[PDB]
Amino acid sequence: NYFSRMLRGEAPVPAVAGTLGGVIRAVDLEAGSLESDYVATDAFLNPVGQVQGGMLGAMLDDVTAMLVTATLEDGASCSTLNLNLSFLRPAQAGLLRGRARLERRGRNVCNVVGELSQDGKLVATATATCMV
Amino acid sequence: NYFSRMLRGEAPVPAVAGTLGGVIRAVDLEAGSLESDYVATDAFLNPVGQVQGGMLGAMLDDVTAMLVTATLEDGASCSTLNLNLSFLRPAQAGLLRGRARLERRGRNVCNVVGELSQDGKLVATATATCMV
Cβ atoms B89, A79 nearer than 8 A: no
Instruction: Please tell me the distance from the alpha carbon of residue B100 to that of residue B65, in angstroms, as a whole number.
Output: 9
A120 Rama sector, left if φ>0, alpha if ψ -120 to 50, beta otherwise? left
Domain boundaries, chain B: 1-132
Nearest-Cα residue of chain A relative to residue B90: A79
Residue A60: list chain B partners with CB under 8 A.
54
In this structure, the dihedral spanned by the alpha carbons of residues B98, B103, B109 and B115, taken in order and rounded to 10 degrees, is -20
Q: What angle is formed at CA A57 by the lines to CA A55 and CA A82, rounded to 5 degrees?
A: 140
Instruction: Please tell me the distance from the alpha carbon of residue A127 to that of residue A130, in angstroms, as a whole number.
Output: 10
CA-nearest of B77, B26, B56 to A55 is: B56
Q: Kindly report the number of other CB atoms within 10 A of residue A75's CB atom.
A: 6
Helix (H, G, I), strand (E, B) or coil at B34: strand
Residue A130: list chain B partners with CB under 8 A.
none
CA-nearest of A63, A55, A51 to A90 is: A51
To the nearest whole Å, the CA of B23 is away from the closest chain A CA by 15
B26 has which bridge partners?
B35
Cβ atoms A79, A132 nearer than 8 A: yes
A49 Rama sector, left if φ>0, alpha if ψ -120 to 50, beta otherwise? left
Show me where chain A is broken: residue before each gap, C-N > 2.5 A.
none
Residue B96: list chain A partners with CB under 8 A.
none
**A130 φ, ψ to 5°?**
-125, 140
Helix (H, G, I), strand (E, B) or coil at B59: helix
Classify B1-132 by CATH class: alpha beta
Nearest-Cα residue of chain B relative to residue A128: B85
Q: Which of A52, A72, A84 to mutate to test the interface with B (most CBs of B within 10 A)?
A: A52
- Model resolution, angstroms: 2.2
